[PDB]
Structure formats: C-alpha cells, structure tokens
C-alpha cells in the first residue's frame, strides 16, 4: 500500500507524528533505513520531510491536518517553511522564538483551533533544537511556546513517537 | 472556480496586502499579479513605507472601472522576508514568496490530486530552499532535476503551467551558467507568456 522508509539515525519525528495521526484513517507501514522515503505508487516518491507531511495530510481526509480552507492551508505552509528554515538554524534563535511566542499568544494550536501539520513540524523541529532545550534548562524560555509545547508533549501520540524514536 | 469561501469565519477575500523589501524584489509575485489580472479585476496600488528611502523608479511603477473582485496593495518595506496579510493589521502574517505564490495561484481554482499537488509544492520548495541560496554544486543539481522532469513533461509538474513553473522560473532570473536543453526550452515556454514577459522588463 503506502510505505515510509525513515532514517533511523535522525528520525523525522514530525513525519512519524504524522503517520500516527493518520493510521486508523490510512494504512501505512514504517521501515528502518538510512534516509527518508515515502513510496506511494510504482515509482512515485517523496524524499524531503515537508513533501511527505503534505502528502500524508492530503490523503488522510478524516484527520484534517491540512486545515479547512485556503487561508488555513496557506497558514500551514507558512509554518512548514518556518520550521524548515528559521528554526532549523543556530543563529537568531532568539528572534525566531519570540516570533513564535507572539503568534501563540492567543492561540492554542498554531492554525484553526485543532491539530495540524503546522503543529507537528514546528514541535518536531523545536524538540531537536539545542537552543530550545538550553532555554529550557535555564528557565529562560518564552511563556507561550512553553505552554503550547508542553501541551503537545503531554499527548499520547507525542509520547508514543517520542518513546520509540527520540535520540537524545 | 472563482469562489470566495477562502476564510471560514471572516468575510470573503477582498484586499490583499503584501510587504516586500526593494533590495530583494519578488519577481514571482510580480508575475503572478499579472496572471491574476487576466482572470480577475484588480485594483493595484504601490506604497512605500516610512522605513524606506529611494525605492527605484521601476519598482514604484510596477503596477501602473465600476467594481473590483480583488484588491492588491504592494508596500515596499524593510522586511527580511516577504509578507502577506488580508487586513490593515494582523498578528501572524504569511511569510515567504513561495507561500504567497501558492495562495495566489490557488485563486485560479485548478485542483490537483494528492500526488500532483505535492509535487507542485515540492518544486516550489526546491526553488526556495536550494536554488535560491544554493552553492553551484547545489544549483547544478537542481538544473539536473528539472531537466529530467522537463523531458517527461513540457511543464515542471505536468502538462499544465503551475505555480511550480512560475516560482522556479522567477527565482532563476535573480540568481557561471551551463543549462540543459529541456530547461532552456522550458524557459522559452515561459517567456513567451505575456505575464512572465512584462514583469521581467520591470526589474530592468
């Protein structure tokens, strides 16, 4: 059917979170490997995490991980690039974190009051970022992100994937 | 399509406001704007923000009846990355010309199955994440990929022009050149089009 080969070295937590949220809805298997590959048909594949996240959310209709309207669709894209660039970075973390903090000031979830790709990719990156944790040791982390991060980290799915996959 | 069901609780789309840096003009957006005009009645206006001085003349005149479907305001402003918002003020603007491009093109309503929609997205991602700031080794790799796919199809994502074509083409223009022939052909395919054509002229 639909198979995903992950890189068991630096696991794409975000994608695996995604797989877990679409399992009942879609039949998907995960295999160990040295790289990330989503096998869809005979020879159509996706290699970069953001393409895999988009295909999964597009196919898992029940899950509603890609929003409900063009606006939320575009917001979710914004957070995909945000996580793949500003957050996938050592420099200007502080500028980046503050930006995220401002956005979460009045939100519970990043987009549309329910879980979405945006929530997965940002959280996954935010976990695997050293600066975030250092802030965590220090207790210097911004208030909103801490709540949002904490809220997600406490959910069953976020702990199943964490337990099985998190290198640290 | 042409529908206006775009924002679920808020009113239907009317005015789009874009902030862009003039040291870094967004050719994709200029091109897309021209494209929208063919299919929509647009009110276009350029502002310059307080924080900017001496915006070049070409940049100022880059847009120069009874009622409008869409309003398009470009504000030249000192921003690190391009932004989009739907009201005079907002909290989380959509950043990044790639994301702004997907949204605008979508207003045309040309739907795609999950695989094609994701491939279209993937190309847009390559232009932004690899081709835009990439090393020559990276640039060469991209060219290679396009060439392979442009021998399968006349357009990057299939038989029709997508936002994949617009974005990657525009990025190409603003960045040592060895160019495959499918790519060199596909360039021509694009330049033939009026919208692509005029916008290129504005950057001079």
JSON list of C-alpha atoms in Angstrom, two decimals, chain B residues 41-189:
[
{"chain": "B", "resi": 41, "resn": "UNK", "atom": "CA", "xyz": [-10.41, 42.63, -11.93]},
{"chain": "B", "resi": 42, "resn": "UNK", "atom": "CA", "xyz": [-7.72, 44.06, -9.77]},
{"chain": "B", "resi": 43, "resn": "UNK", "atom": "CA", "xyz": [-7.17, 47.31, -8.01]},
{"chain": "B", "resi": 44, "resn": "UNK", "atom": "CA", "xyz": [-3.44, 47.63, -7.69]},
{"chain": "B", "resi": 45, "resn": "UNK", "atom": "CA", "xyz": [-1.57, 50.07, -5.58]},
{"chain": "B", "resi": 46, "resn": "UNK", "atom": "CA", "xyz": [2.03, 50.56, -4.53]},
{"chain": "B", "resi": 47, "resn": "UNK", "atom": "CA", "xyz": [3.02, 52.21, -1.27]},
{"chain": "B", "resi": 48, "resn": "UNK", "atom": "CA", "xyz": [6.43, 52.82, 0.24]},
{"chain": "B", "resi": 49, "resn": "UNK", "atom": "CA", "xyz": [6.77, 52.52, 4.00]},
{"chain": "B", "resi": 50, "resn": "UNK", "atom": "CA", "xyz": [8.35, 55.18, 6.30]},
{"chain": "B", "resi": 51, "resn": "UNK", "atom": "CA", "xyz": [11.36, 52.96, 6.92]},
{"chain": "B", "resi": 52, "resn": "UNK", "atom": "CA", "xyz": [12.46, 53.06, 3.29]},
{"chain": "B", "resi": 53, "resn": "UNK", "atom": "CA", "xyz": [14.21, 55.66, 1.18]},
{"chain": "B", "resi": 54, "resn": "UNK", "atom": "CA", "xyz": [14.98, 55.88, -2.51]},
{"chain": "B", "resi": 55, "resn": "UNK", "atom": "CA", "xyz": [12.99, 52.96, -3.86]},
{"chain": "B", "resi": 56, "resn": "UNK", "atom": "CA", "xyz": [13.91, 52.72, -7.53]},
{"chain": "B", "resi": 57, "resn": "UNK", "atom": "CA", "xyz": [11.50, 54.14, -10.04]},
{"chain": "B", "resi": 58, "resn": "UNK", "atom": "CA", "xyz": [10.86, 50.89, -11.84]},
{"chain": "B", "resi": 59, "resn": "UNK", "atom": "CA", "xyz": [9.76, 49.47, -8.59]},
{"chain": "B", "resi": 60, "resn": "UNK", "atom": "CA", "xyz": [7.29, 52.27, -7.93]},
{"chain": "B", "resi": 61, "resn": "UNK", "atom": "CA", "xyz": [5.50, 51.97, -11.25]},
{"chain": "B", "resi": 62, "resn": "UNK", "atom": "CA", "xyz": [5.43, 48.19, -11.37]},
{"chain": "B", "resi": 63, "resn": "UNK", "atom": "CA", "xyz": [1.61, 48.14, -11.45]},
{"chain": "B", "resi": 64, "resn": "UNK", "atom": "CA", "xyz": [1.00, 51.33, -13.42]},
{"chain": "B", "resi": 65, "resn": "UNK", "atom": "CA", "xyz": [-13.94, 50.68, -13.65]},
{"chain": "B", "resi": 66, "resn": "UNK", "atom": "CA", "xyz": [-17.23, 50.05, -11.87]},
{"chain": "B", "resi": 67, "resn": "UNK", "atom": "CA", "xyz": [-16.12, 47.48, -9.27]},
{"chain": "B", "resi": 68, "resn": "UNK", "atom": "CA", "xyz": [-13.19, 45.27, -8.31]},
{"chain": "B", "resi": 69, "resn": "UNK", "atom": "CA", "xyz": [-13.11, 41.43, -7.38]},
{"chain": "B", "resi": 70, "resn": "UNK", "atom": "CA", "xyz": [-9.69, 41.80, -5.87]},
{"chain": "B", "resi": 71, "resn": "UNK", "atom": "CA", "xyz": [-7.61, 44.50, -4.32]},
{"chain": "B", "resi": 72, "resn": "UNK", "atom": "CA", "xyz": [-3.82, 44.22, -4.44]},
{"chain": "B", "resi": 73, "resn": "UNK", "atom": "CA", "xyz": [-1.62, 46.53, -2.30]},
{"chain": "B", "resi": 74, "resn": "UNK", "atom": "CA", "xyz": [2.17, 46.20, -2.56]},
{"chain": "B", "resi": 75, "resn": "UNK", "atom": "CA", "xyz": [4.00, 48.00, 0.24]},
{"chain": "B", "resi": 76, "resn": "UNK", "atom": "CA", "xyz": [7.78, 48.39, -0.16]},
{"chain": "B", "resi": 77, "resn": "UNK", "atom": "CA", "xyz": [9.11, 47.98, 3.36]},
{"chain": "B", "resi": 78, "resn": "UNK", "atom": "CA", "xyz": [12.34, 46.91, 5.06]},
{"chain": "B", "resi": 79, "resn": "UNK", "atom": "CA", "xyz": [11.43, 43.26, 5.70]},
{"chain": "B", "resi": 80, "resn": "UNK", "atom": "CA", "xyz": [13.76, 40.25, 5.96]},
{"chain": "B", "resi": 81, "resn": "UNK", "atom": "CA", "xyz": [11.22, 38.09, 4.17]},
{"chain": "B", "resi": 82, "resn": "UNK", "atom": "CA", "xyz": [8.17, 38.87, 2.06]},
{"chain": "B", "resi": 83, "resn": "UNK", "atom": "CA", "xyz": [4.82, 39.02, 3.85]},
{"chain": "B", "resi": 84, "resn": "UNK", "atom": "CA", "xyz": [1.14, 38.77, 3.17]},
{"chain": "B", "resi": 85, "resn": "UNK", "atom": "CA", "xyz": [-1.91, 39.81, 5.21]},
{"chain": "B", "resi": 86, "resn": "UNK", "atom": "CA", "xyz": [-5.62, 40.27, 4.46]},
{"chain": "B", "resi": 87, "resn": "UNK", "atom": "CA", "xyz": [-6.46, 43.31, 6.55]},
{"chain": "B", "resi": 88, "resn": "UNK", "atom": "CA", "xyz": [-4.75, 46.51, 7.53]},
{"chain": "B", "resi": 89, "resn": "UNK", "atom": "CA", "xyz": [-3.43, 44.84, 10.66]},
{"chain": "B", "resi": 90, "resn": "UNK", "atom": "CA", "xyz": [-2.60, 41.26, 11.75]},
{"chain": "B", "resi": 91, "resn": "UNK", "atom": "CA", "xyz": [-0.59, 39.13, 14.18]},
{"chain": "B", "resi": 92, "resn": "UNK", "atom": "CA", "xyz": [0.81, 36.20, 12.15]},
{"chain": "B", "resi": 93, "resn": "UNK", "atom": "CA", "xyz": [1.49, 37.24, 8.58]},
{"chain": "B", "resi": 94, "resn": "UNK", "atom": "CA", "xyz": [2.21, 34.59, 5.97]},
{"chain": "B", "resi": 95, "resn": "UNK", "atom": "CA", "xyz": [5.93, 34.99, 5.26]},
{"chain": "B", "resi": 96, "resn": "UNK", "atom": "CA", "xyz": [7.92, 33.86, 2.21]},
{"chain": "B", "resi": 97, "resn": "UNK", "atom": "CA", "xyz": [7.29, 34.42, -1.51]},
{"chain": "B", "resi": 98, "resn": "UNK", "atom": "CA", "xyz": [6.91, 30.69, -2.11]},
{"chain": "B", "resi": 99, "resn": "UNK", "atom": "CA", "xyz": [3.95, 30.53, 0.25]},
{"chain": "B", "resi": 100, "resn": "UNK", "atom": "CA", "xyz": [2.46, 33.72, -1.06]},
{"chain": "B", "resi": 101, "resn": "UNK", "atom": "CA", "xyz": [2.72, 32.28, -4.59]},
{"chain": "B", "resi": 102, "resn": "UNK", "atom": "CA", "xyz": [0.86, 29.10, -3.78]},
{"chain": "B", "resi": 103, "resn": "UNK", "atom": "CA", "xyz": [-2.02, 31.00, -2.33]},
{"chain": "B", "resi": 104, "resn": "UNK", "atom": "CA", "xyz": [-2.41, 33.41, -5.22]},
{"chain": "B", "resi": 105, "resn": "UNK", "atom": "CA", "xyz": [-2.22, 30.76, -7.84]},
{"chain": "B", "resi": 106, "resn": "UNK", "atom": "CA", "xyz": [-4.82, 28.81, -5.98]},
{"chain": "B", "resi": 107, "resn": "UNK", "atom": "CA", "xyz": [-7.38, 31.53, -6.55]},
{"chain": "B", "resi": 108, "resn": "UNK", "atom": "CA", "xyz": [-7.49, 30.19, -10.15]},
{"chain": "B", "resi": 109, "resn": "UNK", "atom": "CA", "xyz": [-9.04, 27.02, -8.67]},
{"chain": "B", "resi": 110, "resn": "UNK", "atom": "CA", "xyz": [-7.18, 24.40, -10.73]},
{"chain": "B", "resi": 111, "resn": "UNK", "atom": "CA", "xyz": [-7.38, 21.39, -8.43]},
{"chain": "B", "resi": 112, "resn": "UNK", "atom": "CA", "xyz": [-4.90, 18.53, -8.31]},
{"chain": "B", "resi": 113, "resn": "UNK", "atom": "CA", "xyz": [-4.89, 15.01, -6.82]},
{"chain": "B", "resi": 114, "resn": "UNK", "atom": "CA", "xyz": [-2.80, 14.49, -3.66]},
{"chain": "B", "resi": 115, "resn": "UNK", "atom": "CA", "xyz": [0.27, 13.37, -5.63]},
{"chain": "B", "resi": 116, "resn": "UNK", "atom": "CA", "xyz": [0.35, 16.21, -8.17]},
{"chain": "B", "resi": 117, "resn": "UNK", "atom": "CA", "xyz": [-0.47, 18.86, -5.52]},
{"chain": "B", "resi": 118, "resn": "UNK", "atom": "CA", "xyz": [2.51, 17.59, -3.51]},
{"chain": "B", "resi": 119, "resn": "UNK", "atom": "CA", "xyz": [4.85, 17.55, -6.47]},
{"chain": "B", "resi": 120, "resn": "UNK", "atom": "CA", "xyz": [3.89, 21.12, -7.34]},
{"chain": "B", "resi": 121, "resn": "UNK", "atom": "CA", "xyz": [4.67, 22.04, -3.74]},
{"chain": "B", "resi": 122, "resn": "UNK", "atom": "CA", "xyz": [7.97, 20.15, -3.90]},
{"chain": "B", "resi": 123, "resn": "UNK", "atom": "CA", "xyz": [9.27, 22.19, -6.83]},
{"chain": "B", "resi": 124, "resn": "UNK", "atom": "CA", "xyz": [8.35, 25.46, -5.11]},
{"chain": "B", "resi": 125, "resn": "UNK", "atom": "CA", "xyz": [10.34, 24.16, -2.16]},
{"chain": "B", "resi": 126, "resn": "UNK", "atom": "CA", "xyz": [13.38, 23.45, -4.39]},
{"chain": "B", "resi": 127, "resn": "UNK", "atom": "CA", "xyz": [13.49, 26.98, -5.82]},
{"chain": "B", "resi": 128, "resn": "UNK", "atom": "CA", "xyz": [13.30, 28.48, -2.33]},
{"chain": "B", "resi": 129, "resn": "UNK", "atom": "CA", "xyz": [15.30, 26.06, -0.17]},
{"chain": "B", "resi": 130, "resn": "UNK", "atom": "CA", "xyz": [18.01, 25.00, -2.69]},
{"chain": "B", "resi": 131, "resn": "UNK", "atom": "CA", "xyz": [18.17, 27.01, -5.88]},
{"chain": "B", "resi": 132, "resn": "UNK", "atom": "CA", "xyz": [17.77, 30.42, -4.23]},
{"chain": "B", "resi": 133, "resn": "UNK", "atom": "CA", "xyz": [20.70, 30.37, -1.87]},
{"chain": "B", "resi": 134, "resn": "UNK", "atom": "CA", "xyz": [22.46, 27.31, -3.19]},
{"chain": "B", "resi": 135, "resn": "UNK", "atom": "CA", "xyz": [26.08, 26.62, -3.98]},
{"chain": "B", "resi": 136, "resn": "UNK", "atom": "CA", "xyz": [26.95, 25.97, -7.58]},
{"chain": "B", "resi": 137, "resn": "UNK", "atom": "CA", "xyz": [27.02, 22.31, -6.75]},
{"chain": "B", "resi": 138, "resn": "UNK", "atom": "CA", "xyz": [23.51, 22.75, -5.49]},
{"chain": "B", "resi": 139, "resn": "UNK", "atom": "CA", "xyz": [22.47, 24.80, -8.46]},
{"chain": "B", "resi": 140, "resn": "UNK", "atom": "CA", "xyz": [23.80, 22.17, -10.86]},
{"chain": "B", "resi": 141, "resn": "UNK", "atom": "CA", "xyz": [21.85, 19.53, -9.01]},
{"chain": "B", "resi": 142, "resn": "UNK", "atom": "CA", "xyz": [18.68, 21.48, -9.35]},
{"chain": "B", "resi": 143, "resn": "UNK", "atom": "CA", "xyz": [19.20, 22.00, -13.03]},
{"chain": "B", "resi": 144, "resn": "UNK", "atom": "CA", "xyz": [19.61, 18.35, -13.34]},
{"chain": "B", "resi": 145, "resn": "UNK", "atom": "CA", "xyz": [16.46, 17.55, -11.69]},
{"chain": "B", "resi": 146, "resn": "UNK", "atom": "CA", "xyz": [14.47, 19.97, -13.77]},
{"chain": "B", "resi": 147, "resn": "UNK", "atom": "CA", "xyz": [15.96, 18.71, -16.96]},
{"chain": "B", "resi": 148, "resn": "UNK", "atom": "CA", "xyz": [14.96, 15.19, -16.18]},
{"chain": "B", "resi": 149, "resn": "UNK", "atom": "CA", "xyz": [11.37, 16.17, -15.40]},
{"chain": "B", "resi": 150, "resn": "UNK", "atom": "CA", "xyz": [11.14, 18.60, -18.33]},
{"chain": "B", "resi": 151, "resn": "UNK", "atom": "CA", "xyz": [11.84, 15.72, -20.69]},
{"chain": "B", "resi": 152, "resn": "UNK", "atom": "CA", "xyz": [8.86, 13.86, -19.21]},
{"chain": "B", "resi": 153, "resn": "UNK", "atom": "CA", "xyz": [6.53, 16.89, -19.33]},
{"chain": "B", "resi": 154, "resn": "UNK", "atom": "CA", "xyz": [6.51, 20.30, -21.02]},
{"chain": "B", "resi": 155, "resn": "UNK", "atom": "CA", "xyz": [5.95, 21.90, -17.58]},
{"chain": "B", "resi": 156, "resn": "UNK", "atom": "CA", "xyz": [7.66, 21.13, -14.28]},
{"chain": "B", "resi": 157, "resn": "UNK", "atom": "CA", "xyz": [4.66, 19.39, -12.75]},
{"chain": "B", "resi": 158, "resn": "UNK", "atom": "CA", "xyz": [2.83, 18.18, -15.80]},
{"chain": "B", "resi": 159, "resn": "UNK", "atom": "CA", "xyz": [1.06, 19.24, -18.96]},
{"chain": "B", "resi": 160, "resn": "UNK", "atom": "CA", "xyz": [-0.22, 22.49, -17.45]},
{"chain": "B", "resi": 161, "resn": "UNK", "atom": "CA", "xyz": [1.57, 25.54, -16.12]},
{"chain": "B", "resi": 162, "resn": "UNK", "atom": "CA", "xyz": [1.54, 25.52, -12.33]},
{"chain": "B", "resi": 163, "resn": "UNK", "atom": "CA", "xyz": [2.88, 27.77, -9.58]},
{"chain": "B", "resi": 164, "resn": "UNK", "atom": "CA", "xyz": [5.85, 25.40, -9.72]},
{"chain": "B", "resi": 165, "resn": "UNK", "atom": "CA", "xyz": [6.75, 26.84, -13.08]},
{"chain": "B", "resi": 166, "resn": "UNK", "atom": "CA", "xyz": [6.23, 30.49, -12.10]},
{"chain": "B", "resi": 167, "resn": "UNK", "atom": "CA", "xyz": [8.25, 30.37, -8.90]},
{"chain": "B", "resi": 168, "resn": "UNK", "atom": "CA", "xyz": [11.25, 28.41, -10.10]},
{"chain": "B", "resi": 169, "resn": "UNK", "atom": "CA", "xyz": [11.47, 30.41, -13.30]},
{"chain": "B", "resi": 170, "resn": "UNK", "atom": "CA", "xyz": [11.35, 33.68, -11.30]},
{"chain": "B", "resi": 171, "resn": "UNK", "atom": "CA", "xyz": [14.00, 32.55, -8.86]},
{"chain": "B", "resi": 172, "resn": "UNK", "atom": "CA", "xyz": [16.24, 31.58, -11.79]},
{"chain": "B", "resi": 173, "resn": "UNK", "atom": "CA", "xyz": [16.19, 35.13, -13.10]},
{"chain": "B", "resi": 174, "resn": "UNK", "atom": "CA", "xyz": [17.53, 36.77, -9.92]},
{"chain": "B", "resi": 175, "resn": "UNK", "atom": "CA", "xyz": [20.50, 34.47, -9.32]},
{"chain": "B", "resi": 176, "resn": "UNK", "atom": "CA", "xyz": [28.57, 30.57, -14.13]},
{"chain": "B", "resi": 177, "resn": "UNK", "atom": "CA", "xyz": [25.83, 29.08, -16.27]},
{"chain": "B", "resi": 178, "resn": "UNK", "atom": "CA", "xyz": [25.51, 25.71, -18.06]},
{"chain": "B", "resi": 179, "resn": "UNK", "atom": "CA", "xyz": [21.91, 24.99, -18.98]},
{"chain": "B", "resi": 180, "resn": "UNK", "atom": "CA", "xyz": [20.32, 21.76, -20.10]},
{"chain": "B", "resi": 181, "resn": "UNK", "atom": "CA", "xyz": [18.11, 21.90, -23.17]},
{"chain": "B", "resi": 182, "resn": "UNK", "atom": "CA", "xyz": [14.77, 20.88, -21.67]},
{"chain": "B", "resi": 183, "resn": "UNK", "atom": "CA", "xyz": [15.27, 23.69, -19.18]},
{"chain": "B", "resi": 184, "resn": "UNK", "atom": "CA", "xyz": [16.42, 26.08, -21.93]},
{"chain": "B", "resi": 185, "resn": "UNK", "atom": "CA", "xyz": [13.25, 25.09, -23.83]},
{"chain": "B", "resi": 186, "resn": "UNK", "atom": "CA", "xyz": [11.01, 25.48, -20.79]},
{"chain": "B", "resi": 187, "resn": "UNK", "atom": "CA", "xyz": [12.46, 28.94, -20.19]},
{"chain": "B", "resi": 188, "resn": "UNK", "atom": "CA", "xyz": [11.31, 29.92, -23.69]},
{"chain": "B", "resi": 189, "resn": "UNK", "atom": "CA", "xyz": [7.88, 28.36, -22.97]}
]
